[PDB]
Design a protein around this ligand. Structure first.
Ligand SMILES: Nc1ncnc2c1ncn2[C@@H]1O[C@H](COP(=O)(O)OP(=O)(O)O)[C@@H](O)[C@H]1O
Ligand SMILES: Nc1ncnc2c1ncn2[C@@H]1O[C@H](COP(=O)(O)OP(=O)(O)O)[C@@H](O)[C@H]1O
Ligand SMILES: [Mg+2]
Ligand SMILES: [Mg+2]
Lengths: 74, 160, 118, 371, 371
């Protein structure tokens, strides 16, 4: 439904999620620290997305339940 | 005794002392403490929060059925715990929804009698023909082919 | 059968179901944690040159932005789920409100105390 | 803050804060100037006793209601009544409280506009909203459909509602109400010798009507029984002694509701204007209206009316439909309970007529979107 | 994955997954906005009730069909109907399912092109295919020849087919159908006193037509019998009581099919357009078409039509040929059963209009090889 607006919102949010940092301005220990930090960040990403999947599954089951009970009226 | 002692703790030892003082207020007094049976109606008259006829019927079923003419301390506290508001408000709507979803292992949008039997026997309780069939008469009010959502949502109203 | 006995059996069943739900929630939490551990691969940064480590970090960040895109997609989906849940709740409340409009109020606030003022 | 749910009515002003079960202060709406001369000096005699104070000094006053039939005929007295209600019966200044007045259907516009202008200029409320007296009575019953017959003391109106959609072409407003029944009772009491004339004695006749009269299930049989036996004659003690005995005046006073030809009115009774109001509705919602007929208002408190009305409608209606008459025990305050419920809603919180809106469009704002 | 066999129709939308026996969800195709004002706040009142929900609140709605005669006259409402069908009656997102719409013969091109454009842009299906409503009804009978008369609710069309080769020059499409019969019944009921005017009461007249009307074997004899005896008068109870008695209106309403001069249409009845459709065919396949005449569609469910039509055709046709009329008991859903069978075929699996093909040629792809 007006996928142009959805794509624009996606672009804005992704720009909000956009992270551009220095890539050649740190030493080896700092570089490894940044790598570990990015690993932890994407690990939190994996955890949050797993939570999102679980909650979506729960929502879908509840939607099925509510739809069944509202159809049970007649 | 577990449910019995839980009800005992419902009217705790402080409440026990308060109601013992009240009992001394409405007891015959100036006696050996032989304990009468009419004191269970005297407390009903004294409190103002008169117990419902269901509680009195339970008392008759439990006591005075043999013409004892007195009430045991255990039976007296049984009646007393039956008058005070030891309510559980029937859990919560979210809690009911969760429990019923777990009961709906088949995800049928309702609870089946086989599901009910399996859930009950998973608790270890002796669920025989005296159960289920009576629960078909008692637990399931609609009996319209299954235990529909509103049927068991309303069935566990104000229960523990 | 006696009402008290049936009520006790119902209470036992509900408590057992709640305990099973809590145990299953513990199982879900542990399983989800372990799977999350498996999703993120171990990092061995020892003895890594500037070029290798920098390229690896850039690849990780590219995958991170890909994860951002996927989370945006599933976020749109979960918002759709929330919207349809709200619509279902609204319709159910509408069906119930054919007879349950005066349900939400508060009565007997302060007038029951004031009696002898006149 | 909390909202003030006032309800002007005609005969009893009922008010109280939103969210309770019963109105805080209920008192007759009469303003009576003294009529004699007065010889004691320094007695502290006021020039007008309003509200419940003038029901105790009514022996030397000339009580006059400021609301005749829903409409307001004497604006100064109504302003005085409102001022009393706010300051002495509730003791809350109106500068810090929204108000929710109530108005009968099909009333003159000027009445409503003047009401909002007074509330915004004199009392200076933050925001006020005017609601139809029948929708509230439907709120209080917890329904969402049904046809409500709100037989107040000023005017009897019959608003049908389905699924929340009011039917504006099916409102049947009839001007017979409790006051005309009081006058007719005062007129038929003269057939035994008791003459009540003074405007103060109208209150005594009202008390007689409230305490003794009842609606007969079948009129002719009661007229025949009261003319042979004497099992109906109930006595009543006036405010000074000299008990009186009411015979078949007991069920003849409230019978005027079902036969308005008694007081010379042409229209049909409250038993037939409900059926006519139903028949104007669409053919597919008549069953629901038949099954959810709601009674409200003070005058519907006569003992035995919920059976007479059901019998009459069952006689008129088709034999298959089920006729059910909802008569809650809290009939008198049904409108105010509904008003409290409506004012307590979150969805309704943005429908108030805010003062800045009134400043921009004048008093004619009430007819606009903010109804 | 599985295919969605939708069937827009005109009067009842029938849908369901391919490979079953009966449609999963069947509901009237009406979209009705509320028409009154609405006074209850927070009741959750929507702006348009579609499908079977608007057949329960029809007392305060203005139902309007989005499909007049096969063609679609109101594209926004049709889009709303499709959205409801996909999301609430089947609960399957269209992003993962092919669709198989159905369309009457000889319909405007723009209708079909707009249909495919909607299905590909708004709902974003993987692939959709449009099929003629009569070939499916021939599939369901398990035949491969025969002339099928698919008298729906919008339009009656008569497609002859032989050995799988359709004859495009012999399709006789006539615009008399169930809706015109409903209007004519509603118009002749006024001869007894019953007046139905509102668009909601058209549904009541439709129910009367479905439950009571039947096709007479011989028209004049029935007209004479109903005018002397009273063995035909069947009564029916309205949605509010007040039973009505239908006399010779019973077989006069569906007689319009065989004499379209009743509603002022010039053309010949469904008994003679079939014979004309046969006679346009070649001289060597007329025997097979005579022997395999197929009935379908809802309106051919009148009790006693499979005998009247056979008698009429036997009167018209040469005396030697055998006339047989196939009238399966599952007539109403015959088109959808055939659609399910066609979508379940392996040979048909490469005829879908794939989305990349639409992206390359635009909506005009439907008229091309992928028909
Ligand atoms: N218990 C009762 N029995 C009979 N009539 C009553 C009773 N209470 C009130 N009334 C009549 O109803 C009138 C009050 O109606 P009310 O509902 O207060 O009117 P309003 O709609 O103006 O508030 C009184 O004038 C009285 O005549
Ligand atoms: N049992 C029945 N008897 C007589 N007429 C019927 C019956 N069922 C349906 N109809 C008529 O057929 C119409 C439905 O036809 P249908 O085949 O659903 O049309 P479509 O081809 O658009 O699906 C209804 O409008 C009704 O008038
Ligand atoms: Mg009133
Ligand atoms: Mg069709």
């Amino acid at each position: 439904g007006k996928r142009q607006t959805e794509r624009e919102k996606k672009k804005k949010i992704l720009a909000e999620r956009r992270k551009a940092l220095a890539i050649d301005h740190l030493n080896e220990d700092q570089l490894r620290e940044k790598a570990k930090e990015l690993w932890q960040s994407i690990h939190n990403l994996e955890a949050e997305k797993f939570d999102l999947q679980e909650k979506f599954k729960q929502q879908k089951y509840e939607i099925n339940v509510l739809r069944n009970r509202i159809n049970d009226n007649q | 005794d577990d449910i019995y002692k839980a009800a005992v703790e419902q009217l705790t030892e402080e409440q026990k002392n308060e109601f013992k003082a009240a009992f001394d207020i409405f007891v015959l007094g100036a006696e050996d403490g032989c304990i009468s049976t009419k004191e269970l109606g005297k407390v009903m008259r004294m409190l103002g929060q008169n117990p419902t006829p269901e509680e009195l019927q339970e008392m008759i079923d439990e006591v005075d059925e043999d013409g004892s003419g007195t009430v045991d301390f255990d039976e007296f506290l049984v009646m007393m715990v039956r008058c005070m508001k030891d309510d559980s408000k029937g859990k919560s709507e979210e809690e009911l929804s969760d429990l019923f979803r777990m009961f709906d292992k088949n995800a049928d949008g309702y609870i089946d009698l086989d599901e009910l039997k399996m859930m009950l026997q998973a608790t270890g309780e002796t669920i025989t023909e005296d159960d289920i069939e009576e629960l078909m008469k008692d637990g399931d009010k609609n009996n319209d082919g299954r235990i529909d959502y509103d049927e068991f949502l309303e069935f566990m109203k104000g229960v523990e | 059968i006696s009402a008290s006995r049936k009520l006790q059996l119902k209470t036992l069943m509900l408590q057992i179901a709640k305990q099973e739900m809590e145990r299953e929630a513990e199982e879900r939490r542990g399983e989800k944690g372990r799977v999350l551990r498996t999703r993120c691969q171990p990092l061995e940064l020892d003895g890594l040159g500037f070029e290798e480590l920098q390229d690896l970090c850039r690849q990780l960040h590219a995958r991170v932005d890909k994860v951002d895109e996927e989370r945006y997609d599933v976020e749109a989906k979960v918002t759709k789920n929330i919207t349809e849940i709200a619509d279902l709740t609204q319709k159910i409340y509408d069906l119930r409100g054919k007879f349950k409009r005066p349900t939400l109020r508060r009565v007997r606030i302060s007038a029951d105390a004031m009696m002898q003022a006149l | 803050t909390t909202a003030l749910v006032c309800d002007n009515g005609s005969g009893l002003v009922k008010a109280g804060f939103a969210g309770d079960d019963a109105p805080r202060a209920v008192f007759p709406s009469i303003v009576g100037r003294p009529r004699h001369q007065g010889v004691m000096v320094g007695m502290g005699q006021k020039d007008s006793y309003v509200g419940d104070e003038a029901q105790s000094k009514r022996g030397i006053l000339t009580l006059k209601y400021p609301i005749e039939h829903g409409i307001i005929t004497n604006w100064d007295d109504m302003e005085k009544i409102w001022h009393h209600t706010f300051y002495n019966e509730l003791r809350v200044a109106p500068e810090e409280h929204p108000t929710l007045l109530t108005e009968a259907p099909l009333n003159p516009k000027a009445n409503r506009e003047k009401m909002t202008q007074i509330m915004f200029e004199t009392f200076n409320v933050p925001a006020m909203y005017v609601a139809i007296q029948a929708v509230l009575s439907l709120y209080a019953s917890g329904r969402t459909t049904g046809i409500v017959l709100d037989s107040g003391d000023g005017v009897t109106h019959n608003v049908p509602i389905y699924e929340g959609y009011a039917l504006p072409h099916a409102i049947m407003r009839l001007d017979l109400a409790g006051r005309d029944l009081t006058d007719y009772l005062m007129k038929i009491l003269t057939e035994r010798g008791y003459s009540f004339v003074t405007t103060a004695e109208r209150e005594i006749v009202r008390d007689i009507k409230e305490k003794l009269c009842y609606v007969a299930l079948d009129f002719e049989n009661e007229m025949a029984t009261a003319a042979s036996s004497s099992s109906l004659e109930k006595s009543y003690e006036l405010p000074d002694g000299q008990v009186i005995t009411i015979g078949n005046e007991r069920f003849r006073c409230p019978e005027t509701l079902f036969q308005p030809s008694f007081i010379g009115m042409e229209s049909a009774g409250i038993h037939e204007t409900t059926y006519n109001s139903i028949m104007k509705c669409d053919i597919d919602i008549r069953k629901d209206l038949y099954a959810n007929n709601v009674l409200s208002g003070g005058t519907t408190m006569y003992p035995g009316i919920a059976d007479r009305m059901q019998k009459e409608i069952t006689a008129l209606a088709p034999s298959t439909m089920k006729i059910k008459i909802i008569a809650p025990p809290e009939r008198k305050y049904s409108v105010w309970i509904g008003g409290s419920i409506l004012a307590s809603l979150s969805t309704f919180q943005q429908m108030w007529i805010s003062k800045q809106e009134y400043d921009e469009a004048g008093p004619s704002i009430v007819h606009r979107k903010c109804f």
